[PDB]
Amino acid sequence: CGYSDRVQQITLGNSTITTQEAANAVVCYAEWPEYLPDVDASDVNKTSKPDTSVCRFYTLDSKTWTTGSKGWCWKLPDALKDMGVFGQNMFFHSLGRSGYTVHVQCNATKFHSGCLLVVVIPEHQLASHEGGNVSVKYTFTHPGERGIDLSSANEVGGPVKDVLYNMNGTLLGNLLIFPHQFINLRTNNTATIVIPYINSVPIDSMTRHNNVSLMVIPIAPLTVPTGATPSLPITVTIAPMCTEFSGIRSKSIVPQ
Amino acid sequence: CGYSDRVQQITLGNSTITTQEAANAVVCYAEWPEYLPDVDASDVNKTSKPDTSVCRFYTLDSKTWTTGSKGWCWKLPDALKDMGVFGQNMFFHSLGRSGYTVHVQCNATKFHSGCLLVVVIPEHQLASHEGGNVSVKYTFTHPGERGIDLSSANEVGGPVKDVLYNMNGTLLGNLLIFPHQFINLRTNNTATIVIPYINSVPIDSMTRHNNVSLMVIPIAPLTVPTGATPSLPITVTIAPMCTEFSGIRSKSIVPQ
Amino acid sequence: CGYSDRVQQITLGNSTITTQEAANAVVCYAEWPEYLPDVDASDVNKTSKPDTSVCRFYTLDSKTWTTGSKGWCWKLPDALKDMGVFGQNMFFHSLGRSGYTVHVQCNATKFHSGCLLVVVIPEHQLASHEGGNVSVKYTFTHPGERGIDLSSANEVGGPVKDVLYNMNGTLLGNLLIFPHQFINLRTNNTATIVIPYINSVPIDSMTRHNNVSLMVIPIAPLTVPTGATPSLPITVTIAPMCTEFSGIRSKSIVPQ
Amino acid sequence: FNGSETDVECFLGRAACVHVTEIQNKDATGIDNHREAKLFNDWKINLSSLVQLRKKLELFTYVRFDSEYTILATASQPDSANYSSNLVVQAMYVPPGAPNPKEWDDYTWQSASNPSVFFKVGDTSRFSVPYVGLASAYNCFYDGYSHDDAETQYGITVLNHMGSMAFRIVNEHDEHKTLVKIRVYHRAKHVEAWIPRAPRALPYTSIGRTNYPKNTEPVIKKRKGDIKSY
């Protein structure tokens, strides 16, 4: 016996991830991802319950934290559009309630020095590359699985790629009243954020509305020992927990 | 306090080894090395009990696992011929009952990558270098303390040095229904196999009959970091446990 | 949970050190640093109690253990002369009782090989560089915060810098009946010695009398891996515990 | 302390000058000055003008008001002399989802259920408009357009509209000049805030769109010398 970190089987549907280094958990606020928006309507229920088959750990593409890197930003309910049964429930219905659980993991050896900041920003409105009385037309916003990719990928017509203003006009070190956790390669290699559902309307379309932007950004630059590769990977997995949809016994087919 | 691995004094006779890294134990089968072949002959006993003075940890010569290495094979009751009080009991008597305990240790740093397979093969009959209707004449079989030394030491007239057929006609990855344990340099540096006595005749000459071949073979090649030595040592120690001999009050002198 | 070494807040006055690696403690003898030299004089007491405000961890200057280094020697009650409220109590009064707690710390990485010997020598009389019927005139004895600095700093008129005779005529490996602990970079990085007060007179001037020499000396030379800096730092901190002074309601001003 | 000084209700509940305007009443048409700032004015209320250029409310994400517009109207044309003879001013809170007047003598000043008040010039009028919000809180800071369908306008998000104030004069007779300045002070009651948000770096460049302005000066200050202070 000895170290006994919580690395046991978190198997869930088709997903059997169980990769946890220092498995401490920070939830967004005091509220857990909870299913029920109310009790009843004093009526017999056929309420859409896809949590038996939506709670998979849908991972993403891995992204390579180089020394010359600035950050990555995915729009969370619209990152999982072209994938999973969750995406086909997203186009298949219109409105849905989706709490998420985001597990960002960075492979790093003992010898790599650097720090990351993960941050979950609710309703992150974007700042344009035009920077005037116009923004992105929501084609360049949420590519899905690819992110905005702030790391030196500048473009025209859409959002800005300035990382200090984080497409928001805000400030970088000031960003931490949003839920966040620092990935310190001295201490940890992964981060978990538990995201309950957040919207002023209890049920909402995720094809139209971008609930959450997820940002992983390097605050301190990565200094690899020389003779190694100047690149480290970032893997992010989303497990939509206590997820609900609205269009019960209603939706036939919409193709797009 | 903290890690408390079983590294305490296994002192035994002249032997005070107690070098155990991850001191987990795999025994050959469900049977422990046990002394008594029967109860009695309904008679007063002068039964030969050398376990007070045979149970030493007779180590061997160390062998250097290079990158260009193939394997090592010792014939276990006849490896300890020219050494110890056990060898002089072996020539001094004829017949003996000997259970063994084999502790193979490989010094390896944290930086060395490779895997070994130890395997204890009962009654390992040999395949010849001739490969016809003739084998070794049992001069090249069991050199003792030196082994067959499969690593690129080819010869003529005796056994083959082909490692996939392991002098047996069998197959390398198929060899594991014999008792075995993998020395993985990520995980461990040593291996222990507990060998009870095995023969269709309850008491037998060990000068004539080779009970056990012991093989340590590299399945995965050793990749040292460059700038280090391309060699790692293998140390194997034998503790013959619950060992019995037959020639009580009978043997005077046979020199050879 | 896991390793739980005693690394918690040893905060004490202005001092909040709490840097302990393998926080095992060796005291000089069976006697702890104890305040009371007696009970009373059957009288009302105004006894000088500065332990509320003397027990700070007065650190020293750091010293760089190179490969070409020999040792360092501070005279302990007179090392803290020009510093602290303890030094101003030392000149301000004359006589004082001072038990000490010395914590020598050496920053070392995992890759550095070497060993140190700390040793606390009571009443260490010095051997001269003249080596005749004359010694140092106590100007070169106790520079304070700088030490004798045996490492290749030879001089004329004062003490010898010969490290085997350790300014004493004694022998290096024979020195260990004094309180001592070995700083082994395989095992530890720091050392603590708990020094109770020691003098044939119960109360004594520390401006005149050098109670303790403290020596940190490299027994085994430091072999850094090549490509790193050939220097390691030594930090020594003194916490004078259960410290007492004599000149109660007596001392006005003496400047020097 | 449980004292209403640093809490949210005291924080945003102060009354501030929004929407300075200047109207008059001349005639039916008369001299050709009718449409821009004369004879009436519509505001289309939005706290985006001068809540210290949208700062304390932008510090949070989700708010809920209960507004108290206190309309201070005054006669810019010398009230001391005259230009105030029963100059009754008509205010009107046109709720969201209701047609807006665009003429002084227009049908939707007197229409059905549009809360309109009348008061003397140089006096005030106090309102209490309840929380008129489409969402359960005011989405001051919203990500998303209105539809992927027809899509109402753009991500200005005027869907959570608060209202539209209309001011005009009920008087007559072009022979003379008058001028009336109207100054409304919004005050929010029972303010419930949610989801704290990091503050902006620059003063803004647009309403609704969270855009940071180009061509910026350094919002943070250089050290006076080095990391060595004093």
Tell me B49's DSSP state. -
CB pairs under 8 A between A and C: 3
The tokens describing B45, both together, are: 């006993």
Indicate the length of chain C as a whole number: 256
The tokens describing C1, both together, are: 């949970």
Residues in chain C with CB shorter than 8 Å from the CB of A187 are none
| Contact of chains D and A by CB distance (3 or more pairs under 8 angstroms) | yes
Query: Coil, strand, or helix at residue C233?
Result: strand
Residues in chain B with CB shorter than 8 Å from the CB of A1 are 4
Chains in touch with D (3+ beta-carbon pairs under 8 Å) read A
- Whose tokens are 């490692």? That residue is B163
Spell out the alpha helix ranges (H) of C145-227: none
Query: Coil, strand, or helix at residue C119?
Result: strand
Query: Coil, strand, or helix at residue A88?
Result: helix
The C-alpha atoms of residue D32 and residue D39 are separated, in whole angstroms, by 12
Chains in touch with B (3+ beta-carbon pairs under 8 Å) read A, C
Query: Coil, strand, or helix at residue A177?
Result: helix
Inform me whether the C-beta atom of residue B255 falls under 8 Å from chain C C-beta atoms. no
Which sign, positive or negative, has the C-alpha torsion C140, C146, C147, C150? negative
The C-alpha atoms of residue A169 and residue A174 are separated, in whole angstroms, by 11
- Whose tokens are 């290079």? That residue is B66
Inform me whether the C-beta atom of residue A201 falls under 8 Å from chain D C-beta atoms. yes
The C-alpha atoms of residue C81 and residue C62 are separated, in whole angstroms, by 17
Query: Coil, strand, or helix at residue B74?
Result: strand
The C-alpha atoms of residue A189 and residue D153 are separated, in whole angstroms, by 45
Best of A123, A130, A174 to mutate (most D CBs within 10 Å, chain D): A123
DSSP assignment of C38-79 equals: SS-SSS-------GGGT---EE---EEEESS---EEEEHHHH
Query: Coil, strand, or helix at residue B60?
Result: coil
The C-alpha atoms of residue B103 and residue B83 are separated, in whole angstroms, by 18
Strands laid side by side in the B212-223 sheet: B72-75, B212-223, B113-122, B180-184
Which H or E run includes C181?
A: strand C180-184
* Chain B: residue whose CA lies nearest to C5: B1
Neighbours of B1 (CB within 10 A): 6
* Chain A: residue whose CA lies nearest to D146: A208
The tokens describing A54, both together, are: 């939506």
Non-local CB neighbours of B166 within 8 Å, separated by 6+ positions: B172, B175, B215, B217
Interchain CB distance below 8 Å, A125 and D143: yes
The C-alpha atoms of residue A36 and residue A199 are separated, in whole angstroms, by 15
Q: What is the CA radius of gyration of chain C?
A: 19
Indicate the length of chain D as a whole number: 230
Maximum separation of any 2 CA atoms in chain B, in Å: 68
Residues in chain C with CB shorter than 8 Å from the CB of B2 are 2-3
How far off is chain D from A39, nearest CA to CA, in Å? Answer: 19
List strand residue ranges (DSSP E) for chain C, in order: 26-27, 58-59, 63-66, 72-75, 95-106, 113-122, 180-184, 190-195, 204-205, 212-223, 231-238, 241-245
**A77 and A243 in contact (C-beta within 8 Å)?**
no
The C-alpha atoms of residue B75 and residue B54 are separated, in whole angstroms, by 18
How far off is chain C from A167, nearest CA to CA, in Å? Answer: 40
Q: Is A14 left (phi over 0), alpha (psi -120 to 50) or beta?
A: alpha
Interchain CB distance below 8 Å, D209 and A125: yes
Q: How far is CA B157 from CA B154, B170, B209, B214, in A?
A: 10, 21, 20, 22
List strand residue ranges (DSSP E) for chain A, in order: 26-27, 58-59, 63-66, 72-75, 95-106, 113-122, 180-184, 190-195, 204-205, 212-223, 231-238, 241-245
Q: How far is CA A153 from CA A170, A202, C105, in A?
A: 21, 36, 49
- Helix, strand, coil shares, percent, chain C, to 5: 5, 30, 60
**D69 and D167 in contact (C-beta within 8 Å)?**
no
Residues in chain B with CB shorter than 8 Å from the CB of C2 are 2
The C-alpha atoms of residue A83 and residue A88 are separated, in whole angstroms, by 7
The tokens describing A235, both together, are: 């893997």
First to last CA, chain B: 55
β-bridge pairing C72-75 and D16-23: unpaired
Q: Which of C88, C37, C55, C80 is nearest to C210 (CA)?
A: C80
The C-alpha atoms of residue C57 and residue C10 are separated, in whole angstroms, by 10
List strand residue ranges (DSSP E) for chain D, in order: 16-23, 40-42, 60-64, 70-75, 89-94, 116-119, 124-126, 138-139, 164-169, 180-186, 192-196
β-bridge pairing B26-27 and B190-195: parallel
The C-alpha atoms of residue B241 and residue B15 are separated, in whole angstroms, by 13
Neighbours of C98 (CB within 10 A): 27
Residues in chain A with CB shorter than 8 Å from the CB of C1 are 4
Query: Coil, strand, or helix at residue A37?
Result: coil
Which sign, positive or negative, has the C-alpha torsion C83, C89, C94, C95? negative
Q: Burial of C108 by CB count in 10 Å (0-12 exposed, 13-18 middle, 19+ buried)?
A: buried
Degrees, nearest 5: CA angle A69-A71-A77: 150
Q: How was this structure determined?
A: cryo-EM
How far off is chain A from B4, nearest CA to CA, in Å? Answer: 8
The C-alpha atoms of residue A155 and residue A161 are separated, in whole angstroms, by 8
The C-alpha atoms of residue B184 and residue B116 are separated, in whole angstroms, by 7
- Whose tokens are 């090249």? That residue is B140
Indicate the length of chain A as a whole number: 256
Beta bridge partners of C211: none
Q: How far is CA D153 from the centre of its chain?
A: 20
Q: Which of C135, C166, C144, C138 is nearest to C70 (CA)?
A: C166
CA atoms within 13 A on the CB side of A124: 29
The C-alpha atoms of residue D212 and residue A132 are separated, in whole angstroms, by 8
The one-letter code for the residue type at A44 is: V
The tokens describing A204, both together, are: 């909402």
β-bridge pairing C63-66 and D124-126: unpaired
The C-alpha atoms of residue C182 and residue C205 are separated, in whole angstroms, by 31
